[PDB]
Write a protein that binds this ligand. Structure first.
Ligand SMILES: Nc1nc2sc(CCCCc3csc(C(=O)N[C@@H](CCC(=O)O)C(=O)O)c3F)cc2c(=O)[nH]1
Ligand SMILES: NCC(=O)N[C@@H]1O[C@H](COP(=O)([O-])[O-])[C@@H](O)[C@H]1O
Length: 200
């Protein structure tokens, strides 16, 4: 399965994905890394790994739809089969999501449905939970609302801050996001006709 990773920043999930997909049993190959922000560290990791990179500036297109069109163009250019959002901080248009329905995974740093949205760790700490975690899910139109693929619980420790909580969660992310990719790329998991998660 040919895979694209969309990033916006440091790219440590990208790195975890690269690491698993070079294992010989990997059913995924990362063929392109696409970032909407230049000079971010995820682009270095991708170039250090030998993976082609493209930077699409969302300040050169008029529409969200024109912008995703540019991404889709690159995905088609590289004959991509699966799209992994690994720290992509931009919301995708409805038609783009429709076209990739069932082929696009996202890593979100909470136990969904808790703490949808962009500041999940802040939500978790404000709420006062003693357990949080991360989720890999298919991207549906409603944000952080697609079919869940994997989750891993992570403890919240006393005095945690966003810094320390997200450090702990990210170790879990580097576990379940490569596993989730591998489930989907091997055809073990798909999105069923009924749109629920389909094990095979
Ligand atoms: N349809 C759909 N799309 C998507 S994308 C995704 C990955 C995580 C999204 C995190 C996220 C939560 S809010 C937000 C935001 O407001 N971004 C600004 C750009 C901000 C900037 O660049 O400064 C903007 O999109 O304009 C995000 F980026 C999941 C997902 C999904 O489930 N459904
Ligand atoms: N709402 C989406 C969101 O918060 N994504 C989060 O951004 C980070 C990207 O880190 P990385 O660039 O080191 O992989 C990850 O921690 C992921 O959970």
């Amino acid at each position: 399965a040919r895979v694209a990773v969309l990033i916006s920043g440091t790219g440590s999930n990208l790195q975890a994905l690269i690491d698993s997909t070079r294992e010989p049993n990997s059913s995924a190959q990362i063929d392109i890394v696409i970032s909407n922000k230049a000079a971010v560290a995820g682009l270095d990791k991708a170039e250090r790994a030998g993976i082609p990179t493209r930077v699409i500036n969302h300040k050169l297109y008029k529409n969200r739809v024109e912008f995703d069109s540019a991404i889709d163009l690159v995905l088609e250019e590289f004959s991509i089969d699966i799209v992994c959002l690994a720290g992509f901080m931009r919301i995708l248009s409805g038609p783009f999501v429709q076209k990739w329905n069932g082929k696009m995974l996202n890593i979100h740093p909470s136990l969904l449905p808790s703490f949808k949205g962009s500041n999940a760790h802040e939500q978790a700490l404000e709420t006062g939970v003693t357990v949080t975690g991360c989720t890999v899910h298919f991207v549906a139109e409603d944000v952080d609302a697609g079919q869940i693929i994997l989750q891993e619980a992570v403890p919240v420790k006393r005095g945690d801050t966003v810094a320390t909580l997200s450090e702990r969660v990210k170790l879990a992310e580097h576990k379940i996001f490569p596993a989730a990719l591998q489930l989907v790329a091997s055809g073990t998991v798909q999105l069923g006709e009924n749109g629920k998660i389909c094990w095979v």
